[PDB]
Write a protein that binds this ligand. Structure first.
Ligand SMILES: Nc1ncnc2c1ncn2[C@@H]1O[C@H](CSCC[C@H](N)C(=O)O)[C@@H](O)[C@H]1O
Ligand SMILES: Nc1ccn([C@@H]2O[C@H](COP(=O)(O)OP(=O)(O)O)[C@@H](O)[C@H]2O)c(=O)n1
Ligand SMILES: Nc1ccn([C@@H]2O[C@H](COP(=O)(O)OP(=O)(O)O)[C@@H](O)[C@H]2O)c(=O)n1
Ligand SMILES: [Mn+2]
Ligand SMILES: [Mn+2]
Ligand SMILES: [Mn+2]
Ligand SMILES: [Zn+2]
Ligand SMILES: [Zn+2]
Lengths: 443, 880
RNA sequence: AGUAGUUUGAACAGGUUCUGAAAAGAACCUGUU
């Protein structure tokens, strides 16, 4: 694992485009961190999700790293120059009024990740690199512009387009249970995963469920060898070392989409094919052992690279245009991300008080970026909740085919009718409960 | 290579008129100008912007990208939108615009918008030959588009070479007409490397231009921003047409502004000796600095010193671990200590102290003279001025009071106690007093520091709030001897002054307000002057001096010496950061209040009493606009009004420094701003000519940072209690002087905050719960000896709930004159609460899910803090 | 649907501790102008 010196000097941004299983997380990252410790560089490491952070912590044994992620433990002393956190944590700290260190070196794993905060962080990092104040390494196997859904692997992979079931199945589907090895099944939601894993445990196969709600207990259990199925959401589609044998990827998901169509709103557009990068990353979780040649990938459709109307480009621009630092940096998008029409076209910078309300709405109210920006750009204060009831009669929230009606904190009974509609505020029952709490003044 | 901007220009040059007219406004932001244009046609000269440039400049100003301040130079001012917008900003004291005019170019248009009196637009000037001047803000909006990119490049380079000499460590906003040509980019990168700033695209600009703006308050990569703008403009060609985002136009107000920047003229027959002594002291490093920033002060020299002050805060661990729901409240977590380093002191000086206020008109001066004479005669009806002695000063001075030594012969005492005990100190005092008796001063110099307090800020720092001035301990004794009778005889107490509240106490102020609410009249007004001590003219300094007419000849000599040599001729030492280090500047000023003098509170109260009396005069029709402009105004009418009803008008007011509560006989007082603004007492947080807001409930009137609620107890007794937003209290309790985190060595400070909450803010549910939790999480045998140290009294529990209840009964029942009944309260359950709606309105988090979780599981947090401290003796304060 | 987390002025008021037989003195803390 030889490292070019040029990646440690300022104004240099290094893209590392190795195929999955090449060793970016376990070979190159420890060497880069060791060389950065030797040269005394303030270093930041950015993991997309918590499973990637766990893999980093496993692969960084014996180095002084000040972990700032909930997934990992904490025994930092005070002499660490290396921090580890997530993309969203870094971006929300950049939007916050607390100063962040001037890192001399930034390593970002899975720099293709399309969370709005990840794109905003990429823009900020590339802007800092362009000013000659830092150097960056972006580690990703499926970079922007990827059309290969079947990248190179350590071992050959058998790709078969069967018909993966969505819910539990009374009978049939013998190909599923007849398998002898370990299988990683990707599901689009925790509820579908619950149903599938119940059906799988009904057949005498013990199953581990991975989600953001069950990660803390279940990931370490997955790090054993007992299990036979891992039913998981896309929290583990990047950087997860499962030592599995088969991957089952229906290649379907829900995406937030902004519709102008008169009054602008956000909808969770129905089950669509995942992008090529997501499919390639999901396939890359298997075939990582050069000693096992029988690894299988079972999919149920073709991916789409049509990633243009999705809300995360607009939300990334909204987050990037409101980054607040002592030096007053105005950042720009990462260059391969400037070819997106919705990202490049946004002028979303807010005036000071509106920016503070925007950050408060995202962090305290747990509103989506689009809705928080829409509310803040009207000059509405955080504690003012009248906009949740001032909407047109078409923006009525229904539950059980009945109007959602709430008791405000000032002792009034009102119909939930927000001025701006975000489908992520009333999609799941938990999201609806949280939004009802917010609209009632309890949040 | 062909840049993206050149491709965009080629594409733009080949649009038909229809598609060009659709493209130029596709998706841009745009202000509505129809009403403003109709008004401007009809000759209306108020509230209207003269062009679209006011909104464009406002976009940068509200994003803090440019902060106009001081003197503003507007090159290519055109009609004057930028200059007229900058006139209304509070930090701007003078606007000068230069436009070429003539045929084919816009000429300046006269307007009477807010601050118009400080605007001078000169036509017929070609800025390419105008010599550079010193300015605090420079706004350049020069450049005209041509279809040829090379012509635009040449014009842009010419503008960039013209504006460069004008820039020296100041604010700027400069239009770069054509920023995509490579030579313009290299020039801009060199200019940014030298001066700073950043290129920013304004969303109000049309799509038919590639113009960007070089701003001072920003950083970033110029090439990337230019590329982003080029891609934006190219993408705008093909996407579907969008109606531009209409936003409402800027309202520019109306009325003049009471600002002035005339330089200071030193006396040098009063202050020459002090400056000569100072120069002789630090002769080794004495120099004269031409980069000094002082505009309205006289500058005499500088010498190198080692910087003092700090800008750091320490986190209080016990309070922070027990107030978790407030970790997400910005008003709580953004509290910090004010910046008192030379940088922060210099910023405070530049904003507040380094300003000037215009002279009042002759009628205003005459009214002030009459009112001050009558008020001084009223205040001394039963009291005579008297000399204070060295015995009282020795009895009163704090042991750790700052010596404030300026000259070497004064720097041989470590504490004030040692100095007042010594016999050489009083010999220094005697020689300076002998100089004073001859009308000369030789050693009365003001040290200047910053106030170190808790304030809302960001990035761990808060803006400096004020400047504190103080002389050497001997000079402080001399001014105590001359003028200390005002404080020691209680001249501004409620009994003697009818409107002062000196010696009252915060918790007892609400009763006073309630007593004011029973006087018939209009609403209740409470206005604060913006930077009160910097608005003190020489006129009201003389009016304060007028007290010397009630003294005996020797006391009069001493008081005249203090008033004329030290209060009206002030020599100050102030720190300044320079690239070579830190220097101390010797500056001079004649008119202001030196907050830190012995007569600060009393003379502030006196001047505010007379200002509010004059405002009541104006509100009652005794003073009109013509009376205030009259060099020969009649004294009989003012004297008649005073002798007839001045005491009754004084009884309608509660005065503490510049805080005032006034309940006039009607509401014309709300609009009586002529005399008030002419005396220089410009109100804060409000346009200079907007009528003031009056409260009809005395329980909402803010006074001394608080308002007051009337609680009713179970036994039917009433109780007026102080209250403020809860975030302020919680945030102030969570930080302290120092740096870093602190848990064990600030637990007793947290307990003291809990005791203060239990005593003054017992009516707030969150505050009582948090105080009980903090007390339960602090070892019961520790007693503080400083802010960080403690002693262990193993035989005694410091303050139990019973001790706190006893203190509460003493303060609110036994020692309360306003409660006729005196039955003590036996349990904390009889101590009342605010109503739940009142509690919620004043910032409580009751009714929130995080607050409910915190209250339910509070014992877990108390035990966590207990284990963090260690194995100590703990007592439970939480009610059963 | 999914994912990530808050990182040494002047005037005054009140309280506390120690000394004192009480007065009174000594020290500290918080707050207001
Ligand atoms: N060489 C030059 N010297 C001085 N003024 C010039 C100039 N070249 C152009 N100008 C003036 O600069 C102006 C540019 S437009 C200024 C708009 C202004 N901000 C507002 O809000 O009204 C034009 O009116 C033109 O008259
Ligand atoms: N405990 C582990 C974890 C991973 N590995 C293997 O090490 C290879 C590279 O691991 P990696 O996490 O760095 O993969 P990439 O991040 O480069 O995609 C993979 O083939 C893993 O299967 C292992 O041998 N033992
Ligand atoms: N800590 C303080 C606060 C106020 N003051 C005096 O009280 C005046 C007004 O007080 P303030 O709190 O309203 O502040 P400003 O109005 O001056 O900005 C000040 O100008 C000072 O003269 C003081 O001497 N020490
Ligand atoms: Mn990896
Ligand atoms: Mn004030
Ligand atoms: Mn005030
Ligand atoms: Zn003197
Ligand atoms: Zn209140």
């Amino acid at each position: 694992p030889e490292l070019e010196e040029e990646m440690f000097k300022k104004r240099n941004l290094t893209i590392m485009d190795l195929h999955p299983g090449s060793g970016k997380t376990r070979k190159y990252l420890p060497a880069i961190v060791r060389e950065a410790i030797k040269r005394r560089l303030r270093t930041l490491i950015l993991a997309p999700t918590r499973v990637v952070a766990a893999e980093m912590e496993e692969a960084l044994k014996g180095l002084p790293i000040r972990y700032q992620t909930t997934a990992t433990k904490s025994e930092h002393t005070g002499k660490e120059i290396v921090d580890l956190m997530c993309h969203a944590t870094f971006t929300m700290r950049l939007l916050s009024p607390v100063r962040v260190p001037n890192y001399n070196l930034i390593i970002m794993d899975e720099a293709h990740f399309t969370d709005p905060a990840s794109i905003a962080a990429r823009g900020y990092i590339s802007t800092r690199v362009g000013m000659g104040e830092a150097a960056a390494i972006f580690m990703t196997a499926t970079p922007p512009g990827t059309a290969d859904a079947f990248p190179q692997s350590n071992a050959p992979i058998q790709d078969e387009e069967r018909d993966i079931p969505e819910r539990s199945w009374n009978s049939g589907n013998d190909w599923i249970t007849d398998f002898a090895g370990k299988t990683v099944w990707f599901v689009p939601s925790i509820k579908a995963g619950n149903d599938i894993a119940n059906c799988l445990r009904k057949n005498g196969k013990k199953v581990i469920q991975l989600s953001r709600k069950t990660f803390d207990t279940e990931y370490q259990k997955t790090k054993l060898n007992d299990w036979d199925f891992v039913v998981t959401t896309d929290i583990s589609e990047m950087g997860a070392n499962f030592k599995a044998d088969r991957v089952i990827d229906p290649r379907r998901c829900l995406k937030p989409v902004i519709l102008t169509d008169g009054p602008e709103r956000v909808i969770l557009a129905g089950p669509m094919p995942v992008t090529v990068a997501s499919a390639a990353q999901r396939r890359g979780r298997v075939g990582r052992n050069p000693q096992k040649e029988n690894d299988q990938y079972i999919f149920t459709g073709q991916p789409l690279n049509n990633d243009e109307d999705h809300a995360h480009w607009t939300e990334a621009k909204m987050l990037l245009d409101n980054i607040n630092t002592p030096e007053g940096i105005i950042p720009a998008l990462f260059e391969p991300e400037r070819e997106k029409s919705a990202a490049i076209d946004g002028e979303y910078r807010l005036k000071g008080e509106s920016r503070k309300t925007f950050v408060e709405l995202m962090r305290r109210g747990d509103l989506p970026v689009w809705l928080a920006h829409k509310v803040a750009s009207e000059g509405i204060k955080y504690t003012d909740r009248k906009w949740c009831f001032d909407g047109e009669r078409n923006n009525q929230i229904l539950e059980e085919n009945m109007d959602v009606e709430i008791w405000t904190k000032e002792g009034e009974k009102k119909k939930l009718r927000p001025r701006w509609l975000d489908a992520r505020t009333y999609s799941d029952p938990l999201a609806l409960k949280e939004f009802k709490d917010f609209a009632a003044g309890r949040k | 290579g062909e840049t993206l901007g050149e491709k965009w220009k080629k594409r733009l040059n080949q649009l038909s008129r229809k598609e060009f007219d659709l493209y130029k406004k596709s998706g841009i932001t745009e202000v509505d100008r129809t009403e403003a244009k109709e008004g401007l046609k009809r000759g209306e000269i108020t509230h209207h912007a003269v062009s679209r440039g006011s909104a464009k400049l406002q976009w940068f100003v509200e994003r803090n990208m440019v902060i106009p301040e001081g003197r503003v130079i507007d090159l290519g001012c055109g009609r004057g939108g930028w200059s007229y917008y900058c006139a209304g900003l509070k930090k701007v004291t003078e606007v000068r615009g230069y436009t070429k005019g003539g045929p084919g170019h816009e000429e300046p248009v006269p307007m009477s918008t807010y601050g118009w009196n400080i605007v001078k637009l000169m036509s017929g000037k070609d800025v390419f030959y105008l010599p550079p001047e010193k300015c605090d803000t420079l706004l350049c909006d020069i450049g005209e588009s041509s279809p040829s990119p090379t012509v635009e490049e040449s014009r842009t380079i010419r503008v960039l070479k013209m504006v460069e000499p004008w820039l020296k460590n100041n604010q700027f906003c400069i239009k770069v007409l054509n920023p995509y040509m490579p030579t313009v980019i290299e020039h801009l990168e060199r200019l940014q490397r030298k001066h700073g700033g950043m290129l920013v695209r304004n969303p109000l600009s049309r799509n038919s231009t590639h113009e960007m703006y070089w701003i001072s308050n920003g950083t970033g990569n110029i090439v990337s921003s230019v590329n982003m703008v080029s891609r934006l403009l190219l993408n705008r060609f093909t996407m579907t047409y969008r109606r531009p985002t209409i936003e409402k136009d800027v309202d520019l107000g109306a009325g003049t502004r009471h600002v002035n920047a005339e330089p200071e003229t030193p006396n040098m027959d009063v202050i020459g000796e002090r400056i000569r002594r100072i120069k002789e002291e630090h002769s080794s490093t004495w120099h004269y600095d031409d980069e000094n920033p002082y505009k309205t002060w006289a500058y005499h020299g500088s010498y190198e010193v080692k910087a003092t002050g700090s800008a750091s805060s320490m986190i209080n661990g016990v309070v922070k671990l027990l107030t978790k729901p407030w970790d997400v409240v910005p008003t709580v977590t953004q509290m910090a200590m004010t910046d008192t380093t030379p940088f922060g002191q210099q910023r405070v000086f530049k904003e507040k102290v380094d300003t000037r206020t215009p002279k009042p008109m002759p009628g205003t001066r005459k009214v002030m003279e009459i009112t001050a004479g009558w008020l001084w005669r009223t205040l001394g009806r039963n009291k005579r001025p008297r000399l204070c002695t060295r015995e009282e000063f020795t009895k009163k001075v704090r042991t750790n009071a700052a010596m404030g030594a300026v000259f070497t012969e004064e720097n041989q005492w470590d504490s004030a106690r040692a100095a007042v005990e010594d016999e050489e100190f009083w010999k220094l005092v005697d020689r300076e007093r002998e100089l004073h008796k001859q009308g000369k001063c030789g050693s009365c110099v003001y040290n200047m520091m910053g106030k170190r307090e808790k304030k809302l800020g960001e990035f761990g720092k808060a803006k400096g709030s004020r400047a504190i001035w103080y002389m050497w301990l001997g000079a402080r004794y001399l001014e105590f001897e001359a003028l200390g009778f005002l404080n020691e005889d209680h001249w501004f107490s409620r009994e003697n002054s009818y409107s002062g509240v000196e010696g009252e106490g915060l918790h007892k102020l609400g009763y006073i307000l309630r007593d004011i609410s029973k006087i018939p009249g209009g609403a209740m007004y409470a206005d604060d002057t913006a930077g009160w001590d910097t608005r003190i003219t020489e006129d009201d300094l003389h009016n304060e001096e007028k007290i010397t007419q009630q003294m005996d000849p020797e006391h009069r000599q001493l008081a005249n010496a203090i008033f004329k040599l030290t209060y009206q001729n002030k020599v100050v030492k102030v720190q300044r950061p320079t690239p070579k280090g830190t220097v101390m500047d010797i500056i001079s000023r004649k008119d202001q209040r030196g907050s830190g003098q012995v007569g600060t509170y009393g003379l502030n109260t006196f001047t505010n009493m007379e200002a509010q009396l004059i405002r009541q005069m104006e509100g009652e029709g005794v003073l009109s606009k013509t009376d205030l402009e009259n060099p020969h105004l009649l004294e009989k009418k003012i004297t008649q009004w005073l002798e007839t009803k001045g005491v009754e008008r004084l009884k309608r007011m509660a005065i503490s420094g510049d805080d005032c509560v006034v309940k006039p006989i009607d509401d014309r007082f709300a609009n009586a701003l002529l005399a008030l603004n002419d005396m220089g007492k410009v109100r804060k947080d409000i346009p200079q000519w907007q009528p003031s807001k009056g409260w009809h409930d005395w329980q909402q009137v803010p006074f001394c940072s608080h308002h007051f609620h009337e609680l009713i107890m179970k036994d039917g007794r009433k109780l007026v209690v102080p209250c403020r937003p809860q975030d302020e209290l919680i945030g102030r309790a969570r930080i302290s002087q120092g740096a870093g985190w602190s848990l064990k060595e600030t637990a007793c400070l947290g307990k003291a905050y809990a005791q203060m909450w239990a005593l003054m803010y017992f009516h707030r549910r969150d505050l009582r719960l948090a105080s009980n939790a903090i007390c339960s999480a602090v070892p019961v045998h520790w007693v503080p000896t400083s802010r960080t140290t403690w002693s262990i009294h193993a035989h005694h529990q410091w303050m139990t709930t019973e001790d706190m209840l006893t203190v509460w009964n003493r303060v609110w029942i036994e020692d309360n004159p306003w409660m006729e009944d005196k039955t003590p309260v036996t349990t904390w359950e009889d101590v009342p609460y605010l109503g739940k709606r009142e509690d919620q309105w004043c910032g409580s988090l009751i009714g929130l899910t995080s607050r409910a979780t915190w209250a339910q599981n509070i014992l877990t947090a108390i035990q966590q803090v207990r284990s963090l401290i260690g194995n100590e003796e703990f007592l439970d304060y939480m009610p059963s």
